[PDB]
Design a protein around this motif. Structure first.
Motif, PDB file in Angstrom:
ATOM      1  N   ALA B  46     -24.625 -46.493   9.619  1.00 38.17           N
ATOM      2  CA  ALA B  46     -24.244 -45.761  10.818  1.00 38.17           C
ATOM      3  C   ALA B  46     -22.780 -45.360  10.784  1.00 38.17           C
ATOM      4  O   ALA B  46     -22.436 -44.213  11.100  1.00 38.17           O
ATOM      5  N   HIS B  47     -21.902 -46.272  10.358  1.00 38.79           N
ATOM      6  CA  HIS B  47     -20.501 -45.865  10.323  1.00 38.79           C
ATOM      7  C   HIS B  47     -20.190 -44.928   9.157  1.00 38.79           C
ATOM      8  O   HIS B  47     -19.289 -44.085   9.272  1.00 38.79           O
ATOM      9  N   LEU B  48     -20.965 -44.979   8.064  1.00 35.55           N
ATOM     10  CA  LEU B  48     -20.725 -43.986   7.016  1.00 35.55           C
ATOM     11  C   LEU B  48     -21.224 -42.596   7.410  1.00 35.55           C
ATOM     12  O   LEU B  48     -20.591 -41.586   7.069  1.00 35.55           O
ATOM     13  N   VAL B  49     -22.337 -42.516   8.141  1.00 35.19           N
ATOM     14  CA  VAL B  49     -22.799 -41.222   8.641  1.00 35.19           C
ATOM     15  C   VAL B  49     -21.831 -40.663   9.684  1.00 35.19           C
ATOM     16  O   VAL B  49     -21.609 -39.450   9.743  1.00 35.19           O
ATOM     17  N   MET B  50     -21.178 -41.527  10.467  1.00 41.12           N
ATOM     18  CA  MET B  50     -20.142 -41.021  11.371  1.00 41.12           C
ATOM     19  C   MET B  50     -18.920 -40.506  10.625  1.00 41.12           C
ATOM     20  O   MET B  50     -18.284 -39.543  11.074  1.00 41.12           O
ATOM     21  N   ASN B  55     -16.273 -35.544   8.537  1.00 40.36           N
ATOM     22  CA  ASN B  55     -15.985 -34.631   7.438  1.00 40.36           C
ATOM     23  C   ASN B  55     -16.423 -33.210   7.770  1.00 40.36           C
ATOM     24  O   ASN B  55     -15.730 -32.250   7.420  1.00 40.36           O
ATOM     25  N   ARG B  56     -17.552 -33.050   8.458  1.00 35.41           N
ATOM     26  CA  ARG B  56     -17.961 -31.695   8.819  1.00 35.41           C
ATOM     27  C   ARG B  56     -17.160 -31.151   9.997  1.00 35.41           C
ATOM     28  O   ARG B  56     -16.732 -29.993   9.975  1.00 35.41           O
ATOM     29  N   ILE B  57     -16.950 -31.962  11.022  1.00 35.33           N
ATOM     30  CA  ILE B  57     -16.225 -31.565  12.223  1.00 35.33           C
ATOM     31  C   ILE B  57     -15.014 -32.471  12.336  1.00 35.33           C
ATOM     32  O   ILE B  57     -15.177 -33.687  12.478  1.00 35.33           O
ATOM     33  N   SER B  58     -13.816 -31.878  12.326  1.00 35.39           N
ATOM     34  CA  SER B  58     -12.563 -32.560  12.009  1.00 35.39           C
ATOM     35  C   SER B  58     -12.258 -33.716  12.965  1.00 35.39           C
ATOM     36  O   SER B  58     -12.813 -33.814  14.060  1.00 35.39           O
ATOM     37  N   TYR B 153     -31.108 -33.488  -2.423  1.00 35.15           N
ATOM     38  CA  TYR B 153     -29.952 -32.856  -1.810  1.00 35.15           C
ATOM     39  C   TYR B 153     -29.949 -31.382  -2.183  1.00 35.15           C
ATOM     40  O   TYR B 153     -30.144 -31.041  -3.352  1.00 35.15           O
ATOM     41  N   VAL B 154     -29.747 -30.513  -1.196  1.00 36.60           N
ATOM     42  CA  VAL B 154     -29.741 -29.076  -1.445  1.00 36.60           C
ATOM     43  C   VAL B 154     -28.499 -28.399  -0.879  1.00 36.60           C
ATOM     44  O   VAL B 154     -28.389 -27.170  -0.915  1.00 36.60           O
ATOM     45  N   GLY B 155     -27.549 -29.174  -0.378  1.00 36.18           N
ATOM     46  CA  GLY B 155     -26.370 -28.606   0.227  1.00 36.18           C
ATOM     47  C   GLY B 155     -25.323 -28.181  -0.783  1.00 36.18           C
ATOM     48  O   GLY B 155     -25.617 -27.971  -1.958  1.00 36.18           O
ATOM     49  N   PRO B 156     -24.084 -28.019  -0.331  1.00 42.74           N
ATOM     50  CA  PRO B 156     -22.968 -27.813  -1.257  1.00 42.74           C
ATOM     51  C   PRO B 156     -22.399 -29.135  -1.745  1.00 42.74           C
ATOM     52  O   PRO B 156     -22.603 -30.192  -1.151  1.00 42.74           O
ATOM     53  N   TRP B 220      -9.984 -34.453 -16.789  1.00 42.09           N
ATOM     54  CA  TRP B 220     -11.100 -35.231 -16.258  1.00 42.09           C
ATOM     55  C   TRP B 220     -11.825 -34.431 -15.192  1.00 42.09           C
ATOM     56  O   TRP B 220     -11.301 -33.450 -14.672  1.00 42.09           O
ATOM     57  N   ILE B 221     -13.061 -34.836 -14.907  1.00 42.53           N
ATOM     58  CA  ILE B 221     -13.907 -34.208 -13.897  1.00 42.53           C
ATOM     59  C   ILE B 221     -14.420 -35.296 -12.967  1.00 42.53           C
ATOM     60  O   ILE B 221     -14.815 -36.372 -13.427  1.00 42.53           O
ATOM     61  N   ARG B 222     -14.416 -35.025 -11.667  1.00 50.56           N
ATOM     62  CA  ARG B 222     -14.974 -35.941 -10.678  1.00 50.56           C
ATOM     63  C   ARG B 222     -15.965 -35.199  -9.802  1.00 50.56           C
ATOM     64  O   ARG B 222     -15.586 -34.265  -9.091  1.00 50.56           O
ATOM     65  N   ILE B 223     -17.219 -35.623  -9.838  1.00 50.38           N
ATOM     66  CA  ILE B 223     -18.263 -35.057  -8.995  1.00 50.38           C
ATOM     67  C   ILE B 223     -18.268 -35.795  -7.669  1.00 50.38           C
ATOM     68  O   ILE B 223     -18.389 -37.024  -7.636  1.00 50.38           O
ATOM     69  N   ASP B 224     -18.149 -35.036  -6.572  1.00 47.74           N
ATOM     70  CA  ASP B 224     -18.014 -35.495  -5.191  1.00 47.74           C
ATOM     71  C   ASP B 224     -16.891 -36.511  -5.038  1.00 47.74           C
ATOM     72  O   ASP B 224     -17.156 -37.710  -4.917  1.00 47.74           O
ATOM     73  N   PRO B 225     -15.632 -36.073  -5.069  1.00 48.97           N
ATOM     74  CA  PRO B 225     -14.534 -37.044  -5.009  1.00 48.97           C
ATOM     75  C   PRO B 225     -14.333 -37.656  -3.639  1.00 48.97           C
ATOM     76  O   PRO B 225     -13.956 -38.830  -3.551  1.00 48.97           O
ATOM     77  N   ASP B 226     -14.589 -36.915  -2.566  1.00 46.40           N
ATOM     78  CA  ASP B 226     -14.281 -37.364  -1.218  1.00 46.40           C
ATOM     79  C   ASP B 226     -15.388 -38.199  -0.594  1.00 46.40           C
ATOM     80  O   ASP B 226     -15.281 -38.537   0.588  1.00 46.40           O
ATOM     81  N   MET B 227     -16.430 -38.530  -1.367  1.00 44.00           N
ATOM     82  CA  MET B 227     -17.607 -39.285  -0.921  1.00 44.00           C
ATOM     83  C   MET B 227     -18.273 -38.627   0.283  1.00 44.00           C
ATOM     84  O   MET B 227     -18.650 -39.289   1.251  1.00 44.00           O
ATOM     85  N   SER B 228     -18.428 -37.307   0.210  1.00 45.57           N
ATOM     86  CA  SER B 228     -18.924 -36.530   1.334  1.00 45.57           C
ATOM     87  C   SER B 228     -20.439 -36.553   1.463  1.00 45.57           C
ATOM     88  O   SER B 228     -20.970 -35.940   2.392  1.00 45.57           O
TER      89      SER B 228
END
Lengths: 52, 393
Positions: B46-50, B55-58, B153-156, B220-228
């Motif tokens: 629940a707190h990770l989804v918040m 992340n979507r709405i600042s 997952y189908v988003g960005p 180096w390359i990082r896939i999804d760095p911000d844990m979004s």
């Protein structure tokens, strides 16, 4: 050079950090071992091994 | 924690609709039938989804949502009407989403539909290839969506590539039929002249580019760095890219994942990378505490190749022992709180050293016993119970 004149001498001082650390460490280990063996012998005791 | 639990057994379903979750041996209709591990993972998800909704709405709009809920509740809390208005102190999902839509003008219904109503995490398997001719980076990201805990997952998806010209972010659109994503790469003119390579933050550093490939600029390359997203990434870099990401990154989660991925490459360059991380103050201390155990595992894997003393011993005597006596530890002064944690975690990892005979060496065991004997705590303002307990460990 000894008939008529005299100056005093002292004992050899051990100012070495290595041997002072060793002396304080070994004395602390020995007094805590003596204390714990005395308290385990004059009370109820357990043992990791059979009759130990 | 949550990706381990959701791949272990089914998944955590925030906001079920009344069974909605039949993959698990209890009913989720009431709090008193939930397993305790499910309750713990429920609060965690629940707190990770918040955080994802932030992340979507600042974050300032998020705090405005919370202030609007609290202000409705506190205007409700002073009335005397028996619940004509006392139910404004009770929040629902529809009321929370409506207050979000009131303060921001964006609705989060795809994000709510994916991460709340659907009960799964995603798994990413990435591998890259650098096209030297067209100067592009061809990523290959495939998802495992047939495991019991997973979803598609189908988003960005954000990816951060550190090349010689700097750190660049790219957004990838990962539709169901997608596999190869071609992103463009920049120059390699910071290898022509020695210039400093600019990092993710505004600073720039000197890097030793002898391990890098001559034809590729990317470090180096990082896939999804911000844990979004709620994800588990399995990226296949080269070992020098993991060592560059361990040394020069300005993100602690990337340093931790490079420590975690350097256990598969026991080369001496990785030993040099972890030893340079361990010696380095101004690294976050929980990265060095992980580098201790990673260095122990690497040292166990390259026996009959290891040259000098056991791992971290000379480093322990350099950092925490006297200059005149190497085997006598300094008297305890725990006032730094980062070399205290590193000092109490380094023999615990050092004891996992093993010889060719699979027995712990008598050079490390004797070192730990001398750490125990020469321990003097009559001089610091802090207690010694955790350090001595870690010595027993």
């Amino acid at each position: 050079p000894h008939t008529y004149i005299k100056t005093p001498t002292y004992r050899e001082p051990v100012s070495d950090y290595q041997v002072l650390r060793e002396k304080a460490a070994s004395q602390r280990r020995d007094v805590e071992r003596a204390l714990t063996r005395f308290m385990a012998k004059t009370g109820e005791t357990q043992s990791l091994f059979k009759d130990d | 924690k949550i990706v381990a639990y959701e791949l272990k057994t089914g998944g955590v379903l925030l906001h079920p609709i009344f069974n909605p979750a039949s993959h698990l041996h209890f009913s989720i209709k009431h709090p008193h039938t939930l397993s305790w591990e499910y309750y713990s993972m429920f609060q965690c998800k629940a707190h990770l989804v918040m955080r994802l909704i932030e992340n979507r709405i600042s974050m300032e709009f998020m705090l405005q949502v919370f202030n609007k809920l609290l202000s409705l509740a506190s205007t409700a809390s002073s009335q005397k009407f028996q619940s004509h208005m006392w139910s404004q102190m009770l929040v629902s999902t529809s009321g929370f989403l409506k207050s979000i839509s009131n303060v921001s003008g964006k609705d989060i219904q795809p994000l709510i539909k994916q991460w709340v109503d659907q009960s799964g995490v995603v798994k990413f398997y990435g591998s890259f290839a650098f096209n030297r001719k067209r100067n592009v980076l061809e990523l290959e990201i495939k998802q495992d969506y047939t495991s019991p805990g997973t979803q598609k997952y189908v988003g960005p998806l954000k990816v951060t590539v550190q090349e010689l010209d700097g750190s660049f972010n790219h957004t990838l659109q990962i539709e169901e039929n997608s596999l190869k994503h071609d992103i463009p790469c920049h120059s390699k003119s910071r290898r022509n002249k020695k210039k400093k390579i600019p990092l993710m933050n505004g600073e720039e550093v000197d890097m030793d580019l002898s391990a890098m490939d001559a034809d590729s600029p990317l470090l180096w390359i990082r896939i999804d760095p911000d844990m979004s997203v709620l994800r588990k990434v399995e990226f296949e870099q080269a070992d020098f890219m993991w060592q560059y990401q361990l040394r020069y990154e300005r993100d602690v989660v990337a340093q931790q994942e490079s420590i975690l991925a350097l256990e598969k490459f026991p080369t001496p360059a990785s030993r040099l990378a972890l030893t340079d991380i361990l010696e380095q103050e101004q690294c976050f201390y929980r990265v060095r505490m992980s580098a201790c155990f990673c260095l122990a595992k690497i040292a166990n894997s390259m026996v009959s190749t290891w040259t000098g003393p056991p791992a971290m011993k000379s480093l322990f005597t350099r950092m925490f022992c006297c200059k005149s006596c190497p085997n006598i530890v300094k008297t305890n002064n725990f006032m730094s709180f980062q070399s205290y944690f590193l000092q109490k975690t380094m023999p615990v990892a050092m004891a996992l050293l093993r010889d060719v005979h699979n027995l712990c060496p008598k050079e490390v065991l004797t070192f730990i016993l001398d750490l125990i004997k020469y321990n003097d705590n009559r001089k610091n303002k802090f207690s010694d119970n955790y350090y001595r307990a870690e010595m027993i460990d």
